[PDB]
């Protein structure tokens, strides 16, 4: 939907172009952003360098320091559940809950498939 109207891919205008390119739907706004969306799970944002330090969201602060500035709100270090819940936004008439922590893990990489592939020659 572009400004409330359905459009047929690709839709192109000055600065903006949206396409069914490849396996995804890609929205590129020139000098602003690149948004890839496979349509089922993945979704990837490329941002200009000029938005360094001026962004905030699940994608982080874009200041370049990974381990010190994302999860420290009012000097208190917080957790992925907390960080993902701070960046929340309900609908006008919606009260979505907060998902509760999942219990401990199991399985692990028994057959080594993740270690066989990820650590394999391909990468």
């Amino acid at each position: 939907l572009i400004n409330g109207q359905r459009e047929e891919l690709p839709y192109s205008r000055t600065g903006l172009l949206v396409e069914q390119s490849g396996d995804y739907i890609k929205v590129s706004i020139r000098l602003v952003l690149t948004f890839l969306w496979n349509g089922e799970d993945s979704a990837l944002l490329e941002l200009d360098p000029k938005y360094a330090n001026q962004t905030c969201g699940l994608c982080g602060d874009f200041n370049g320091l990974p381990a010190f500035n994302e999860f420290y709100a009012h000097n208190a270090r917080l957790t992925p559940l907390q960080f993902g819940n701070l960046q929340k936004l309900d609908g006008p008439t919606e009260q979505c809950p907060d998902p509760l922590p999942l219990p401990a893990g199991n399985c692990t990489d028994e057959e080594g498939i993740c270690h066989r592939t990820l650590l394999g020659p391909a990468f």
Binding site: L78, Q82, K88, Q95
Partner: protein
């Protein structure tokens, strides 16, 4: 013959609210189903309360809690001053139909 037989449930405190801004208590029927707590598909009324203060009612607390028969109970830290919640729990009412 068939007559409705109905009764209350027990108390369900499946979470301990977390200090901070995004914290609080989120006691939802879907979470109750996931955690293994028995959730009746059909109900008539449910009752919420604070687990640590089992006398003074919800409105006497004055905190912002939404507690409804279709969803459950939710208290968010950021909506209250101080930005915190109490440790709440709730119970539900289950009614079936038994032959006379």
């Amino acid at each position: 013959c068939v007559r409705e037989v109905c009764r209350w449930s027990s108390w369900y405190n499946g979470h301990r609210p977390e200090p901070g801004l995004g914290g609080g208590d989120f006691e939802t029927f879907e979470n109750l189903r996931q955690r293994g707590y028995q959730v009746c598909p059909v109900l008539a009324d449910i009752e919420c309360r604070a687990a640590q203060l089992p006398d003074m009612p919800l409105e006497e607390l004055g905190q912002q809690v939404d507690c409804d028969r279709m969803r459950g109970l939710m208290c968010a830290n950021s909506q209250q001053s101080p930005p915190l919640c109490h440790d709440y729990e709730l119970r539900v009412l289950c009614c079936e139909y038994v032959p006379c």
